[PDB]
Design a protein around this ligand. Sequence first.
Ligand SMILES: CC(=O)[C@H]1CC[C@H]2[C@@H]3CCC4=CC(=O)CC[C@]4(C)[C@H]3CC[C@]12C
Ligand SMILES: CC(=O)[C@H]1CC[C@H]2[C@@H]3CCC4=CC(=O)CC[C@]4(C)[C@H]3CC[C@]12C
Ligand SMILES: CC(=O)[C@H]1CC[C@H]2[C@@H]3CCC4=CC(=O)CC[C@]4(C)[C@H]3CC[C@]12C
Lengths: 225, 225, 225
Amino acid sequence: GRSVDTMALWLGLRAVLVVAGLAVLLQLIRGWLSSKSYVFNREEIARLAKEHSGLDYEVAFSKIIVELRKKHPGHILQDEDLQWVFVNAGGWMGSMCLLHASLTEYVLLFGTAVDTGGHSGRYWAEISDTILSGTFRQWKEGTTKSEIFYPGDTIVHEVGEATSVQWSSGTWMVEYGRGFIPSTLAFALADTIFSTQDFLTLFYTVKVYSKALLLEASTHLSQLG
Amino acid sequence: GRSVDTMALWLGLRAVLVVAGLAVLLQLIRGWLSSKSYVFNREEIARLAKEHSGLDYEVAFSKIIVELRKKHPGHILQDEDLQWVFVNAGGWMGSMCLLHASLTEYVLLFGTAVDTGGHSGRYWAEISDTILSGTFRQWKEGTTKSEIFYPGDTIVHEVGEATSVQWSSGTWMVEYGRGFIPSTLAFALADTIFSTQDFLTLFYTVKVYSKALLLEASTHLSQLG
Amino acid sequence: GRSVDTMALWLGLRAVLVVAGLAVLLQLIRGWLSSKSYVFNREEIARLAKEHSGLDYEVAFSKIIVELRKKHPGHILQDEDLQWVFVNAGGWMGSMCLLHASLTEYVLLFGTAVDTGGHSGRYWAEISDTILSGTFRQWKEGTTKSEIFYPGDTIVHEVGEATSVQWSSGTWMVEYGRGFIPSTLAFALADTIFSTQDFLTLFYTVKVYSKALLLEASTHLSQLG
Ligand SMILES: CC(=O)[C@H]1CC[C@H]2[C@@H]3CCC4=CC(=O)CC[C@]4(C)[C@H]3CC[C@]12C
Ligand SMILES: CC(=O)[C@H]1CC[C@H]2[C@@H]3CCC4=CC(=O)CC[C@]4(C)[C@H]3CC[C@]12C
Ligand SMILES: CC(=O)[C@H]1CC[C@H]2[C@@H]3CCC4=CC(=O)CC[C@]4(C)[C@H]3CC[C@]12C
C-alpha cells in the first residue's frame, strides 16, 4: 500500500543517487588528472582588464586584445576570426567573443545587453571574470544572501563551485578559464539543444572553438619546428 | 598525450560542426522552397495595432479582432475557440491568444504579466510584433547594445535572425508571422518538453493550432465549393 | 501540394494532442487515487510563518523549525540533515532547505537571493507559500494581469493549476505541499537534466528526499512498535 510505494520510491531515489554520485566522482577523476599547460594566469588577465575598466568597454576590448596579442603571440585569434556569438546556458543569455581556447585554458570577452541570470554551471575549471562595465550579482551555494560586483572587480568561480549569476543590461567583462575545458561544453550547449534550438549558434560555437584549437596546435608545431 | 586529446577534441568538434551546418542548410532549403500563400501582410496588421495602441490593451484586443474578422472572414477563430495559453520558449514565459494559423501565416495576441526574457528563436519565418502596451527590448546578434521599443512601435524579427528579447510586466502586442510556420514548433515547444513539463499547455497549443488549420481548410473548401 | 502538407500537419498535431491528453488523464488518475495521509495542514504552516514574518527571515526560519519539531516530533529532519540546495526548475532558480517529505506531504524553506521567475509547474499537488521576506508575483493562466504578494501573505498554487511565478532578490518563504508528491519530481529536476547539468545538485536533492522518506518510515515503525 502506502509503505510499499514509499519503499519503491526510496529505492528509485537511491538509484538516482548512486548514478549522480558516480558521475560526480568521474568528473572529479577526469578533471583532477587533466593536463595543466598554462599560457596565461588569472591575475595577469584581471589586472589588465581592471586597468582599462574605466574606459568605454569597447575601447577596453580593443586595448586588451592588442595587449594580449603583444604578450602572447600565436595564442590569440586573428581579427578575421573574432565574432560575437550568443551563449545560452543555465537559463541565462549573454554573448562572447572568443580570443583563445585550448584543452586547458580559454580567454574570452563576455557580457550581455539584456537583464539576465541563472545557473553558473558546475565543472572542473576555475573561471574568473573582471568587470569592465555593469554589475555582476553572485549568489553562492549554501547561503541565503548574494553579493554585487562592480567595474574593476574580479569574480572567481571556483572549481566544483555552483552559484547563481545575474547580470544587468550593459554588463561586459573579460573572462579567463583554467582547468578541463571540454567538461564545460555540456553546460555551455545544453540550453541550445533543449531550449533555443538555435543550431546556427551551435555551429558558430564549435567553429570558433575548433579554430582556437587549430591555432594552438599550429603554434605548438612552429615552436617545435 | 595532450596533443592526442587536442586532436580528438578537434575531430569531435568538426563532427558537431558539419551536423549543425547541414541542419542549417536543410532549414534554409525547406524554408526557401516552402509555400507562400498570404492572406495578411505585416504592414496591415502593424497599422491596425498601432492605431489602437493608445487604448487600454484589452479594448485594443477586442477592436483588432473585430476589424480582422470584418476584413478576413473565414480566417479568424470564433469566440468559442479564443483562449489564453502560456508560451514557454527560449527561456522566456508569456502567453498568446491565437487568432489565425496556417502552414504559411499566423496572427496572435501575445504578451506577459511578468518580467521575462530570453532567446527569440531562429527559424524560416518573418515575425512582426506591434506593441499595444509595455516595453520590448531587442538585442541583435553581433552587437553589444540593445534597443527598447514602446507602444506603437513594430519590431521585425527577420528570417534566420537570432536576437535576445526582453519584456516588462504588462507588455502586450499583436503578432504576425509569415514563412514556414511548422519550423517554429520545435522552438515553441522545447521549454515545455525539457523544462516546464506542462503537458496540458502542450495539449492546448497543438489543439488551437489544429483548430486554426481546420478553419483554413474549411474556408478553402467553401471557396472552391 | 499545400493542402496535402496542411492535412499531414493536422494529423501530426492530432497525434501530439491525444498523447498529451492521455498523459494529462493519467496524471489525473494517479493523483486523484493517490494516498492522502496528512501530518500537517496548510493553515497551520501559514499561520506559523505569518506570525514570524516580521522577524529577520533567518530568525523566523529557526523559530519555525523549532516550533514544527515541538508539534510534530519524528517528522522533521535533524540539524545534521538540514542543507541549502539550489532548485532550478521551470526557468527559475531558487534554493530550498527540506524539513519534511513523504509520499503525500512536504515542508521546506524556499527562496532566492537573485531576481528570478518562470513556470510554476503543473502537477497533482496543492502548494502553499507564506512569505517571510521579499515579494512574490503570481500570474494565473487565462488572465492578462498578475498580482504581487508581500510578507505575511500566503499564495496557494492549486491542484492542476499553472501560473507564472516571479520573486525578487531576498525573497524567502515557508512552503507546504500536499498531494502526490513524486509527480512533482519531473518538474523539479528537468532544468537540472536539460539546462544546468549540475549533477551534484541532483545528488543533494535525491539524497535529502531519501533521508526524509527514511525518517518517515522510521517514525512509522516506532509508532507501530
Ligand atoms: C559564461 C560561462 O559560463 C563560461 C563558462 C565555460 C565557458 C565555455 C568554455 C568552453 C568554450 C570554449 C569555446 O571555444 C567557445 C566558448 C565556450 C563554450 C565557453 C563559453 C562561455 C562559458 C560557458
Ligand atoms: C512569441 C514567439 O516567439 C512566436 C514565434 C513563433 C510562434 C509560434 C508559431 C507557431 C504556432 C502556431 C499556433 O497555432 C500556436 C502558437 C505557435 C506555437 C506560435 C507561438 C508563438 C511563437 C513561438
Ligand atoms: C518551489 C517549487 O516549485 C516546489 C514545487 C514541488 C517541490 C518539490 C517537491 C518534491 C521534492 C521533495 C524533496 O524532498 C526535495 C525537494 C522537492 C524536489 C521539492 C522542491 C521544490 C518544489 C519543486
